């Protein structure tokens, strides 16, 4: 039994609960149940593995999950996405620092409470759906099968406060013929630590994050697969997910001409980069110095909608423009305090655009037992 509670500006109060049983009723299968609850998300999975199935280091794992997503509580245009599915994954260990994975996934997405907006309705139209633009009471259910691929390079010298090496994670999925949706999606994450001194007290850190996806054969990528930027983990100094396209709402009518907004919706393309200088903490050269890390950083990122038609909506910003790079700068503090790991940051978004929401003070604190 492992439990975890946390509080942060990105996800409010976070609860986690898990149980893992290596051998379930002498079957040899390792079974695990896990749960997560956010301000905006409720997630539950059933994990299955079996080390007696592993062949030449290639392992097989199963997953059965449920997910409840409330987009309004993630600072996005309001909608609800209740989903469930399964995943079967294979793990290939290439070497001591590189692993691969490939699996098949099924997912049922049940959408509701969609607040009519242009970009959202653009995807819906491409799927043959024609729900009213004057009401939030709506529904769209789909069933998809996917092929999932992943690569992880991890050569970081230490887990908690790395000082040398890099970590790269590349993931990709595509819909299989027969699915309701028709799209692909790629994500890339990189972290690189370079120590300048022998004691590794001074370290340069470069982070990047990329995402691109689009529909296939006339379709569009569903909006619930969008990428986001802005927040404690992406571009500090900005409110969570604020970076990128903003919703253009249709007018609401009672049961019997568009509106600009500052509500983010994400996009199908995304680019984020950060440079961070890790330094010693001033005047704490005692035993507590090893558990505290101070840093100065420069963050930037952009999100855009490749299928945004600026011609039909000339009165509104061009949300297909990839060149609206947002930037911020500030200082971060990391502490392995008694109450768990803590991260505090203060950043000033010196380059922002219309609709961006600032959040200079951001912090996350967790605790697991």
């Amino acid at each position: 039994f492992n439990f975890g509670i946390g509080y942060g500006t990105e996800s409010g109060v976070s609860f986690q609960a898990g149980v893992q049983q290596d051998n379930w009723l002498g079957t040899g299968y390792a079974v695990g149940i896990n749960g997560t609850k956010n301000d905006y998300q409720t997630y539950a999975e059933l994990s299955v593995t079996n080390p007696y199935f592993t062949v030449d280091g290639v392992s097989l794992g199963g997953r059965l999950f449920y997910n409840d997503f409330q987009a309004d509580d993630a600072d996005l245009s309001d909608y609800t996405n209740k989903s469930y599915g399964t995943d079967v994954t294979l793990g290939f260990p290439i070497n001591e620092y590189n692993s691969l994975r490939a699996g098949l996934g099924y997912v049922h997405n049940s959408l509701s409470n969609m607040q009519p907006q242009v970009a959202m309705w653009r995807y819906l139209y491409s799927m043959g759906e024609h729900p009213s633009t004057s009401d939030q009471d709506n529904s769209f259910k789909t069933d998809d099968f996917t092929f999932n691929y992943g690569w992880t390079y991890n050569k970081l010298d230490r887990g908690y406060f790395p000082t040398d090496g890099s970590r790269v994670n590349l993931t990709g999925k595509v819909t299989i013929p027969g699915s309701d949706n028709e799209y692909y999606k790629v994500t890339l994450d990189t972290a690189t630590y370079v120590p300048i001194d022998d004691d590794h007290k001074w370290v340069v850190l470069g982070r990047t994050r990329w995402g691109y996806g689009d529909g296939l054969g006339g379709k569009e990528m569903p909006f619930y697969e969008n990428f986001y930027a802005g927040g404690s983990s992406t571009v500090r100094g900005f409110q969570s997910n604020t970076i990128g396209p903003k919703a253009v709402y249709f007018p609401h009518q009672a049961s019997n001409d568009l509106s600009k907004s500052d509500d983010a919706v994400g996009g199908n393309a995304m680019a984020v980069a950060s440079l961070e200088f890790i330094t010693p903490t001033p005047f704490i050269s005692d035993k507590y110095a090893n558990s505290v890390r101070t840093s100065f950083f420069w963050d930037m990122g952009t999100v855009w909608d490749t299928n945004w038609d600026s011609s039909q909506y000339s009165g509104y910003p061009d949300y297909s423009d990839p060149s609206n790079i947002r930037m911020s700068a500030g200082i971060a503090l990391q502490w392995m305090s008694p109450l768990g790991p803590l991260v505090f940051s203060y950043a000033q978004p010196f380059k922002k655009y219309d609709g961006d929401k600032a959040e200079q003070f951001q912090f996350n604190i967790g605790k697991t037992w």
Partner: nanobody
Amino acid sequence: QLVESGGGMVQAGGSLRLSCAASGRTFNGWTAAWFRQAPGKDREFVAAISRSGDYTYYTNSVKGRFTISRDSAKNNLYLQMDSLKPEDTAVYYCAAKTGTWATMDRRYDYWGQGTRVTVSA
């Protein structure tokens, strides 16, 4: 808790100003909205103001006649009701939300008790 005030009875054409406040609370980090329930009917969206406060959204029937706003300190939420019609007769409810705005009542987290507005021919 949310408390509405400013209702009553007015002849068609008149004006009203509804007010909503919460003791010791502010609307700083909240999306706020007004709903109304005409007799025999369901709660329907009237107007809303974004968390940022820079954007306002109205139902078509009241667009151009009603105005939702907040005071500088964000202690009070207002609905200016001009050019009243008989169909505007309803119990008006104040609502608040932590996330982005919506038009469905069940998407809002906190509600007032309602204040009655009657417009006579």
